[PDB]
């Protein structure tokens, strides 16, 4: 499948290398840790890379299901 890259490029669903059997949604806090909370460095990953502490990672297998919740006027 494909996954969006928020860490690398700007944000585009581009197939990943051999390993990521799905996508994911990482979270932490930009270098500015704005009031927007954490970030959304989605992408590809073998499996829910979710950590435990902050490293709040997710998953996404659907076609471009890495479109974190942000695309909205607010």
């Amino acid at each position: 499948i494909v996954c969006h890259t928020t860490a690398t490029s700007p944000i585009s669903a581009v197939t990943c290398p051999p390993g990521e059997n799905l996508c994911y949604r990482k979270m932490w806090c930009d270098a500015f840790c704005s009031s927007r909370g954490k970030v959304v460095e989605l992408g590809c990953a073998a499996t829910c890379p979710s950590k435990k502490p902050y490293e709040e990672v997710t998953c996404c297998s659907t076609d471009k299901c890495n479109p974190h919740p942000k695309q909205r006027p607010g």
């Binding site: 909370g37 460095e41 607010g74």
Partner: peptide, 14 residues
């Protein structure tokens, strides 16, 4: 310019 959890555009996100 960022992909936070409140926007996707580098105008609304940052």
């Amino acid at each position: 310019h960022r992909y936070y959890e409140s926007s996707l555009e580098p105008w609304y996100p940052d």
